[PDB]
Amino acid sequence: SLPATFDLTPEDAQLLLAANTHLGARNVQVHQEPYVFNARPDGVHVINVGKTWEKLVLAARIIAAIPNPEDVVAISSRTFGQRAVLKFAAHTGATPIAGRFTPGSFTNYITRSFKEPRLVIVTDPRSDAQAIKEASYVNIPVIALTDLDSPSEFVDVAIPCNNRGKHSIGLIWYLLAREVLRLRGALVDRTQPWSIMPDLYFYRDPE
Amino acid sequence: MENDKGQLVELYVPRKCSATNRIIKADDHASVQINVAKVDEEGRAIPGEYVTYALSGYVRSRGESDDSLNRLAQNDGLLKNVWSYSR
Amino acid sequence: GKGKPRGLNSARKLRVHRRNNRWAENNYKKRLLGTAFKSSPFGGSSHAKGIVLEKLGIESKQPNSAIRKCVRVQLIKNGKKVTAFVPNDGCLNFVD
Amino acid sequence: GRVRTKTVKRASKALIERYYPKLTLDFQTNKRLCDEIATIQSKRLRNKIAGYTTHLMKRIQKGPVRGISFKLQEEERERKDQYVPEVSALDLSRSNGVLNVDNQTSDLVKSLGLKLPLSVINVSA
Amino acid sequence: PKKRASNGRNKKGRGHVKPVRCVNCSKSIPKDKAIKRMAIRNIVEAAAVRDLSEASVYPEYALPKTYNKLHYCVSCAIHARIVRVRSREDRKNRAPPQ
Amino acid sequence: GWVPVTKLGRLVKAGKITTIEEIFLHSLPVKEFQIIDTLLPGLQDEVMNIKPVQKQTRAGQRTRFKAVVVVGDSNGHVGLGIKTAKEVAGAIRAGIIIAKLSVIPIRRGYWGTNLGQPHSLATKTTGKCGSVTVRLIPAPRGSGIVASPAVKKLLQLAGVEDVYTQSNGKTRTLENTLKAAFVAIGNTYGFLTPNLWAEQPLPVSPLDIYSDEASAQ
Amino acid sequence: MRAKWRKKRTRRLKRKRRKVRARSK
Amino acid sequence: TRSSVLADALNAINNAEKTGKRQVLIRPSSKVIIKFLQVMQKHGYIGEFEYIDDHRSGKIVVQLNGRLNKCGVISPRFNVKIGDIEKWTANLLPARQFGYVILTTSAGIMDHEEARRKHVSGKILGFVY
RNA sequence: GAGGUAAAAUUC
RNA sequence: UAGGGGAUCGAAGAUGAUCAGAUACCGUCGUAGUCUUAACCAUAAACUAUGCCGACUAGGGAUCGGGUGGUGUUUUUUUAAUGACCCACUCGGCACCUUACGAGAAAUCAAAGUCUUUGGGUUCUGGGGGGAGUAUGGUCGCAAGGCUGAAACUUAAAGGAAUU
Ligand SMILES: [Mg+2]
Ligand SMILES: [Mg+2]
Ligand SMILES: [Mg+2]
Ligand SMILES: [Mg+2]
Ligand SMILES: [Mg+2]
Ligand SMILES: [Mg+2]
Ligand SMILES: [Mg+2]
Ligand SMILES: [Mg+2]
Ligand SMILES: [Mg+2]
Ligand SMILES: [Mg+2]
Ligand SMILES: [Mg+2]
Ligand SMILES: [Mg+2]
Ligand SMILES: [Mg+2]
Ligand SMILES: [Mg+2]
Ligand SMILES: [Mg+2]
Ligand SMILES: [Mg+2]
Ligand SMILES: [Mg+2]
Ligand SMILES: [Mg+2]
Ligand SMILES: [Mg+2]
Ligand SMILES: [Mg+2]
Ligand SMILES: [Mg+2]
Ligand SMILES: [Mg+2]
Ligand SMILES: [Mg+2]
Ligand SMILES: [Mg+2]
Ligand SMILES: [Mg+2]
Ligand SMILES: [Mg+2]
Ligand SMILES: [Mg+2]
Ligand SMILES: [Mg+2]
Ligand SMILES: [Mg+2]
Ligand SMILES: [Mg+2]
Ligand SMILES: [Mg+2]
Ligand SMILES: [Mg+2]
Ligand SMILES: [Zn+2]
């Protein structure tokens, strides 16, 4: 149902190949993900760029057409993705939970950090395993940036990414935040690129 | 479930899972319903015209909600050869 | 097949291995060998008749401490000496 | 020998997070100011609060204090967090403009049909 | 009840392998049941290496090491502080403590 | 009077959700007991067993009281709540509360004729909590609830007129026996029955079209 | 008591009993 | 070794209904199962199935619609009287208005609701509901 | 990557 | 049981201490035995306390044995061929790790799963705890013993898992 526009542009394919997003996982490999295609030697695999972009526009399509814009809570306990979820609230409503998940947030309506979202976006299913577990009690769809070795239980439509390098996670958040601004039209044009630089969505060392 | 004349008795026909064709019951708290927007050219997502995909709690506990959504969304017409029927 | 045979021509094994397992009950054991007939001095009866030999002062078992005022009864049809109880509040004076 | 209780650390957290002006790292200006701006019942617990705020004001100018935001790291870190570095972006190729594309990655480019600059470097086993 | 998996040793489908004798109390025990400690040591102590370098007539000399493999039974590896009783969830940790 | 904090709880006071069976469609969790009180005041409380539970301590012997409360009117609505507390009267106050959050619908049908007024269950269901297995078997008209007197009152408060039951295991306890029949009545909807093979096109949740009032404000 | 030394108690009970039985035949 | 092929071919189907597999692969399926799979295909419990043909036994891939609770087997093949079908349709069928205890008559593998109309009986194989 | 260690102590 | 061996260890036993007593633990000495040939006996916590055959259900990393593919590595005399090793895959193994859709009273279990929505083929054993693995009878053995195996009577608890 997407006629001609929403395909992979060559101006965005240089961003994915240079940020090492196409690098897969180690010798460990989950059978549930049919994303292995022309595995490079020394044990690694190659994530399909043409499949990553198309599984990313369905993730931004669920974020759209929601009446409250603030019920999309991004979860991040990984140190490489703490900066890319606070600026996810600067453009959508999208209240984040960074650092500690403080469990008892989806249930336990007594506490002061009780959030009742509609769509939970997860950086990594291993470290944010409490967000996936508590979402199975209160009926929340879960989107996760699953690696090829990440567990894929209790998660919906996922974007195959790498989480081993500094630049592989943050550019995916740049693509998710851009497509939820092209939808719900603030920038009416899709041919011209988005206004500001993609270096803003990358974690900075304290040194 | 009806009777001799009129009277559609015993209401609440429950929801069925779109993947495994199983009944999603009341206390199944792992059930997930997906709302997918109908978009067109030049923005305009038009909130209100949804594509409702309902998934049960068994598919998520098995760990196949990522793969069952690939079958149920490509046959509607909004994907391409990413998901292969041959395996 | 849960241990038991399920053959269509195997009703003989299912009727012998029951008879090899009926000897584990109590009710099936007391009926065939005549335990009510040989031992347990009532010969398959409900009541009987006897002669008092002497009176007993049988002390009750723990934790209770009482004397149950029993008697010794010798039967007529067998001749066995069987202890007996008086289920009232002082009918031992009513018997001799 | 002596460890402060929680109620000393509770009130000292309430003082630093909102009274970072009008207070310095000197004890004598931290002691006589709590007589009016706070309602402390006794002198002994009052000096223990001001004795612990003075201990924490010493370690603010030395380094960042974790878990305490005193209405000035809310402003100075947000103007720092938008770093926006210049055209040396490490994604947009300006130094060695052709992309370092391996052999199996080069087959992925021709599979999707787009035309990109590719520099083939064979990796060893 | 069955608190373990192999329940005494490292025998997986053999029945019987080899009996060995303990070094502390001369107890007969199977070889995979007795725990092992490759107690490698220097032949001299850390305090006797200073006086041996002054008494040596050699310019350079490689220090020998006394290697020995000695086994323990279960009863004389707990009285001696070698192994300790652990919690129920930490029994499964088979990594050597560093 | 009462201030809701759950997103579903603000659609209850406003009146956008009218029937409980609209909440049962989308498997919506119920975390506050005022939700199904303003939509169905016809529930009736009933206590089943109050037994003392004890914990051995250093100085003396600590004891509490467990209360088993089964609520629910007719027309296929029950609720089972088991709560322990330090008193007898305090345990039955919070035993009603858990039973209000655990409301599950019961599908009843016919024995062998679609004549009218459904009285018995549709299919044979069996729940298992602990060792107790309760096999609910559909009965003809006027047959009565053939069950234990603790299981009978849970089925008299269920809208089921006639049912046949079979048990197995240590059914002398009432902790695992009443919970085994509570799984069994919930398994009536979890069974693929024919003449339900038609596909309804998955209607929109009430949290999507009534999200203007169902917010923080 | 221990089920082995009750077994050997009945074991020497057998040898003592059948010896008295064998000298009366 | 193998004793009942029809019993070993339904266990692959029932495990597929529980795990959610939309297809099975059974072997060494005979034509008794072929006349049995057409009973469920007529009533709608399974979709289409394709008997592949090697020379040995053949394999079947049953595309299932997910509308099947359990299709079982009754071993061995008991003899069934007309006055004894009420005993089998009450023990192992959940309700009276549906459920199909199939039983092999001289006309073929056939459910009990058609055996009442044809007034024949025979040996039992299993049950479909 | 090595770093200490065995007296006797029965019953209500 | 009958020969050969009989270095150590060492049921019996003798002594030295400990101890109220110590026929023990500990110390020392030392037969039978441990070894072997030719026969017997044939029980073990002979335990994975889990019959065997067949099918299906779930992911992951190792390893053994065989085999097939490498733009492979190394040994090299002139390139080889093997062998070793690496990568990928597949059978037959001993297993293990994470999980629970399932099972169980629970501990736990890829099997103890596919079991009240209780039928794949098939063999053996058990029916409250004692008295009894006893009595008697039969049979086997040189003997010690093995196998088969009750009753009278007595009791209402015995027992399993887990929590404090
Ligand atoms: Mg016996
Ligand atoms: Mg009995
Ligand atoms: Mg007589
Ligand atoms: Mg007479
Ligand atoms: Mg007498
Ligand atoms: Mg123990
Ligand atoms: Mg052995
Ligand atoms: Mg009691
Ligand atoms: Mg007590
Ligand atoms: Mg009762
Ligand atoms: Mg005794
Ligand atoms: Mg004589
Ligand atoms: Mg000797
Ligand atoms: Mg001695
Ligand atoms: Mg002495
Ligand atoms: Mg002696
Ligand atoms: Mg001695
Ligand atoms: Mg034996
Ligand atoms: Mg063992
Ligand atoms: Mg045994
Ligand atoms: Mg496996
Ligand atoms: Mg399972
Ligand atoms: Mg369970
Ligand atoms: Mg008995
Ligand atoms: Mg025996
Ligand atoms: Mg005998
Ligand atoms: Mg004899
Ligand atoms: Mg002899
Ligand atoms: Mg004998
Ligand atoms: Mg008895
Ligand atoms: Mg008593
Ligand atoms: Mg304890
Ligand atoms: Zn030892």
Side-chain angles (χ1 to χ4, degrees):
Chain A
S1 67
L2 306 180
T5 305
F6 292 164
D7 291 331
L8 182 62
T9 61
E11 65 182 1
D12 293 331
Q14 294 179 356
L15 295 174
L16 291 173
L17 295 174
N20 292 318
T21 62
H22 63 89
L23 276 75
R26 298 295 296 163
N27 197 2
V28 59
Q29 178 60 255
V30 176
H31 184 73
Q32 295 180 356
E33 294 179 354
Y35 291 156
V36 175
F37 180 74
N38 286 320
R40 187 174 67 88
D42 292 331
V44 297
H45 294 90
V46 174
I47 297 170
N48 288 318
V49 175
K51 293 184 181 180
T52 303
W53 180 256
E54 188 169 357
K55 295 293 287 183
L56 191 146
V57 298
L58 272 73
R61 193 172 182 179
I62 302 169
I63 299 169
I66 304 299
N68 295 115
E70 72 270 14
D71 58 358
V72 180
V73 174
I75 304 300
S76 178
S77 66
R78 296 291 300 274
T79 61
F80 288 162
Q82 290 179 357
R83 185 176 174 181
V85 296
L86 269 70
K87 296 182 178 67
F88 189 75
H91 295 166
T92 317
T95 173
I97 296 170
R100 185 173 180 264
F101 178 71
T102 179
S105 297
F106 291 160
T107 60
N108 196 3
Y109 62 94
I110 304 299
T111 188
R112 299 280 80 80
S113 296
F114 176 72
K115 265 64 186 299
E116 188 177 1
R118 189 178 294 275
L119 183 61
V120 168
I121 303 170
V122 176
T123 61
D124 185 71
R126 191 267 309 277
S127 296
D128 291 329
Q130 190 64 253
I132 284 96
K133 182 176 174 66
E134 292 184 355
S136 66
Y137 294 101
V138 71
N139 296 111
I140 299 173
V142 176
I143 296 171
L145 298 175
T146 61
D147 199 358
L148 293 176
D149 54 354
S150 295
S152 65
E153 288 85 4
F154 291 102
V155 294
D156 288 331
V157 49
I159 302 169
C161 298
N162 192 1
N163 49 5
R164 287 176 177 88
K166 188 175 180 179
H167 296 286
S168 296
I169 297 97
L171 191 144
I172 305 298
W173 289 98
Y174 176 75
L175 295 177
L176 289 173
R178 187 179 69 189
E179 292 293 327
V180 300
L181 290 175
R182 291 179 179 177
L183 296 175
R184 294 178 182 270
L187 280 78
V188 71
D189 195 2
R190 291 182 64 93
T191 302
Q192 294 179 357
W194 187 55
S195 178
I196 59 171
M197 177 180 62
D199 291 332
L200 188 62
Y201 292 100
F202 289 107
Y203 181 74
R204 180 66 181 270
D205 292 331
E207 66 183 1
Chain B
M1 65 185 74
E2 293 180 354
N3 53 4
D4 185 74
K5 182 174 72 68
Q7 193 60 256
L8 195 150
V9 75
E10 297 296 324
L11 52 89
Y12 177 67
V13 175
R15 293 185 293 114
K16 292 176 70 68
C17 181
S18 61
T20 61
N21 295 115
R22 293 181 67 187
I23 295 170
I24 296 169
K25 61 184 180 181
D27 55 355
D28 185 74
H29 295 286
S31 67
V32 161
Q33 184 177 2
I34 301 297
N35 291 318
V36 178
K38 291 181 183 292
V39 298
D40 55 355
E41 293 87 4
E42 197 179 3
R44 295 178 67 188
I46 309 168
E49 294 292 327
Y50 293 163
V51 178
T52 59
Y53 288 163
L55 295 174
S56 66
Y58 183 77
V59 181
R60 293 172 63 89
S61 66
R62 178 66 178 86
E64 292 293 330
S65 177
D66 182 74
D67 187 75
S68 296
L69 193 147
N70 291 319
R71 181 181 63 84
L72 295 172
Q74 185 179 2
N75 55 4
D76 186 75
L78 56 94
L79 272 77
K80 63 180 181 291
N81 291 318
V82 173
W83 182 71
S84 296
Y85 182 74
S86 296
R87 181 66 177 170
Chain C
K2 292 186 286 186
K4 62 181 72 174
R6 292 177 181 173
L8 192 145
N9 294 320
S10 69
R12 184 177 293 113
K13 187 177 175 69
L14 292 175
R15 69 180 294 166
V16 171
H17 288 84
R18 291 291 93 190
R19 290 196 296 269
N20 290 319
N21 291 318
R22 293 293 295 273
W23 295 99
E25 279 87 355
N26 194 1
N27 297 115
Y28 191 80
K29 188 65 176 290
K30 300 293 184 182
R31 188 174 66 243
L32 292 178
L33 293 174
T35 306
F37 289 158
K38 294 181 181 180
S39 66
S40 70
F42 290 175
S45 66
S46 66
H47 297 88
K49 185 182 288 185
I51 296 169
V52 171
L53 295 175
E54 64 182 0
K55 294 180 181 179
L56 293 174
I58 301 299
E59 186 178 1
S60 66
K61 293 189 287 184
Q62 296 294 320
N64 293 319
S65 178
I67 297 169
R68 297 296 181 186
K69 305 295 187 292
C70 295
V71 294
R72 292 290 298 273
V73 174
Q74 183 179 3
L75 295 175
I76 298 171
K77 65 182 181 180
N78 289 318
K80 293 181 181 179
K81 294 180 182 179
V82 177
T83 62
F85 182 75
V86 179
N88 293 114
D89 193 1
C91 289
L92 187 66
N93 290 320
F94 288 162
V95 301
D96 290 329
Chain D
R2 60 187 70 185
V3 176
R4 296 179 183 90
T5 185
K6 187 176 181 180
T7 62
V8 177
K9 296 180 186 292
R10 287 178 181 176
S12 295
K13 184 178 183 292
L15 290 175
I16 297 170
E17 290 180 353
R18 68 186 68 188
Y19 294 155
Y20 183 74
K22 299 180 186 294
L23 293 176
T24 62
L25 57 91
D26 185 74
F27 180 77
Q28 296 295 321
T29 187
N30 289 318
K31 177 174 70 176
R32 298 294 180 91
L33 194 144
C34 294
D35 292 331
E36 183 67 28
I37 204 161
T39 62
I40 301 169
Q41 297 294 321
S42 66
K43 186 186 287 185
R44 182 178 176 87
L45 187 142
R46 185 177 63 85
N47 292 319
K48 289 176 70 68
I49 294 172
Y52 184 68
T53 59
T54 305
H55 181 74
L56 292 177
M57 286 294 174
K58 184 175 173 66
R59 62 184 294 274
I60 291 170
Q61 64 182 357
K62 297 297 290 183
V65 175
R66 294 179 66 189
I68 290 94
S69 66
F70 50 90
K71 297 295 289 183
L72 191 274
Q73 291 180 355
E74 188 178 2
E75 294 178 354
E76 290 292 327
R77 297 291 178 89
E78 289 180 353
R79 64 182 293 165
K80 186 68 181 294
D81 189 72
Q82 282 76 241
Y83 182 73
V84 288
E86 291 182 353
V87 297
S88 179
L90 294 174
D91 291 331
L92 181 62
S93 66
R94 293 179 65 88
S95 296
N96 296 115
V98 65
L99 277 75
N100 290 317
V101 176
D102 292 329
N103 196 2
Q104 289 84 17
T105 307
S106 66
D107 292 332
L108 182 59
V109 179
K110 293 181 181 179
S111 297
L112 53 90
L114 294 173
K115 185 179 289 293
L116 294 175
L118 274 71
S119 179
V120 176
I121 290 95
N122 207 167
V123 69
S124 66
Chain E
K2 187 176 178 179
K3 66 186 289 184
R4 291 181 178 91
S6 65
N7 293 318
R9 62 177 64 90
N10 209 162
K11 183 257 288 182
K12 264 65 186 299
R14 291 176 178 89
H16 180 271
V17 282
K18 286 298 290 294
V20 298
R21 300 293 298 273
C22 182
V23 73
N24 196 2
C25 68
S26 299
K27 181 175 173 66
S28 179
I29 186 166
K31 187 176 180 180
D32 55 354
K33 184 172 177 66
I35 65 168
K36 63 184 73 65
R37 292 292 179 269
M38 189 66 204
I40 62 170
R41 290 180 67 188
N42 289 318
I43 191 166
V44 300
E45 292 179 353
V49 72
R50 182 66 60 85
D51 291 331
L52 191 144
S53 295
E54 294 292 327
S56 296
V57 73
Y58 291 159
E60 292 88 5
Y61 180 74
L63 184 63
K65 291 181 181 180
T66 61
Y67 299 95
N68 50 1
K69 182 175 173 67
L70 51 90
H71 298 285
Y72 293 103
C73 67
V74 181
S75 66
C76 291
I78 302 169
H79 180 73
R81 292 179 179 90
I82 297 169
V83 299
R84 292 179 181 176
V85 57
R86 295 181 293 174
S87 67
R88 186 177 180 179
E89 294 293 327
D90 291 331
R91 293 181 187 272
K92 295 182 180 180
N93 193 1
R94 294 181 67 249
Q98 184 178 2
Chain F
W2 177 60
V3 176
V5 72
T6 310
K7 188 181 288 292
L8 192 147
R10 293 181 180 90
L11 295 174
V12 174
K13 186 180 289 293
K16 300 297 186 291
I17 296 170
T18 301
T19 62
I20 303 172
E21 298 295 326
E22 185 68 28
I23 302 169
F24 287 158
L25 287 171
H26 300 284
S27 296
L28 295 173
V30 176
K31 293 177 71 68
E32 292 174 350
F33 64 97
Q34 292 87 12
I35 297 169
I36 50 96
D37 286 333
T38 62
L39 274 70
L40 185 61
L43 275 74
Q44 293 179 356
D45 52 353
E46 179 67 28
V47 64
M48 294 296 172
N49 194 1
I50 299 169
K51 64 181 181 180
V53 292
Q54 293 178 355
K55 186 180 79 176
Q56 183 63 256
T57 185
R58 183 179 182 271
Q61 185 176 2
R62 189 182 67 84
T63 183
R64 288 183 291 172
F65 293 98
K66 184 183 261 77
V68 176
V69 176
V70 175
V71 303
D73 56 351
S74 296
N75 199 359
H77 292 89
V78 293
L80 190 145
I82 297 169
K83 182 67 181 294
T84 182
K86 291 174 71 175
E87 292 180 354
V88 177
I92 61 170
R93 289 179 181 176
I96 297 170
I97 302 300
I98 300 172
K100 298 292 180 67
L101 274 71
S102 179
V103 174
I104 185 166
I106 298 170
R107 181 179 178 180
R108 65 186 184 274
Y110 297 99
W111 182 64
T113 299
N114 292 319
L115 186 62
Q117 295 294 321
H119 62 90
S120 180
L121 276 75
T123 62
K124 293 190 288 186
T125 60
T126 299
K128 183 177 184 293
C129 182
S131 68
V132 178
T133 63
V134 176
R135 183 177 181 179
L136 295 175
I137 295 168
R141 290 180 179 89
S143 296
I145 298 170
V146 182
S148 178
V151 183
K152 186 186 288 184
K153 191 66 183 293
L154 190 146
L155 294 172
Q156 288 179 356
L157 294 174
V160 175
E161 293 180 354
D162 296 327
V163 67
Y164 288 153
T165 61
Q166 292 181 357
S167 66
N168 193 1
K170 187 181 290 293
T171 61
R172 293 183 293 171
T173 185
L174 295 176
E175 178 68 27
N176 291 318
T177 302
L178 294 174
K179 289 176 71 175
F182 183 75
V183 176
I185 52 95
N187 288 318
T188 61
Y189 287 101
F191 186 77
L192 291 171
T193 301
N195 80 17
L196 278 78
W197 292 351
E199 183 178 1
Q200 61 181 357
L202 294 175
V204 182
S205 179
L207 276 74
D208 294 331
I209 59 171
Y210 294 104
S211 178
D212 196 2
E213 294 178 353
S215 295
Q217 292 85 17
Chain G
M1 65 184 290
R2 185 175 176 180
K4 184 181 289 295
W5 301 107
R6 186 179 181 271
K7 187 177 181 181
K8 191 178 287 293
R9 184 184 294 273
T10 61
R11 187 68 63 85
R12 295 182 184 272
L13 189 148
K14 289 181 181 179
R15 187 182 297 114
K16 186 177 179 180
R17 183 171 292 171
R18 68 186 178 181
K19 185 177 179 180
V20 178
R21 184 176 175 87
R23 66 184 293 273
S24 296
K25 290 172 70 175
Chain H
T1 61
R2 293 183 184 272
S3 66
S4 179
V5 177
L6 192 146
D8 291 331
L10 293 177
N11 198 2
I13 297 171
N14 298 124
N15 289 319
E17 294 293 330
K18 293 180 181 179
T19 59
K21 299 287 180 67
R22 297 292 299 273
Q23 66 272 10
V24 301
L25 190 146
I26 61 172
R27 183 183 62 84
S29 176
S30 174
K31 295 183 295 299
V32 180
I33 302 169
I34 296 295
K35 299 293 183 182
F36 175 71
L37 290 171
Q38 291 177 355
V39 176
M40 296 188 287
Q41 192 179 11
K42 182 174 73 176
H43 296 89
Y45 292 99
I46 61 169
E48 65 182 1
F49 63 97
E50 181 171 357
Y51 178 77
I52 73 167
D53 197 2
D54 54 354
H55 295 291
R56 293 174 177 88
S57 296
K59 296 178 182 179
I60 300 170
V61 178
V62 178
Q63 294 298 110
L64 58 91
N65 54 3
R67 291 179 176 92
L68 181 62
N69 287 314
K70 187 180 80 174
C71 54
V73 64
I74 301 299
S75 179
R77 298 176 184 178
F78 286 159
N79 297 115
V80 178
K81 195 184 287 185
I82 292 176
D84 291 330
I85 54 97
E86 295 178 354
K87 295 177 71 66
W88 291 100
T89 59
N91 290 319
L92 47 89
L93 292 180
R96 296 291 301 274
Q97 66 270 17
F98 67 96
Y100 294 99
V101 177
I102 63 100
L103 56 92
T104 300
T105 63
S106 66
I109 291 94
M110 183 177 70
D111 54 354
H112 69 280
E113 293 182 355
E114 191 177 0
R116 296 292 295 164
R117 288 182 285 112
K118 291 179 70 67
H119 198 275
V120 295
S121 179
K123 293 181 176 67
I124 191 168
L125 296 178
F127 59 95
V128 172
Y129 63 95

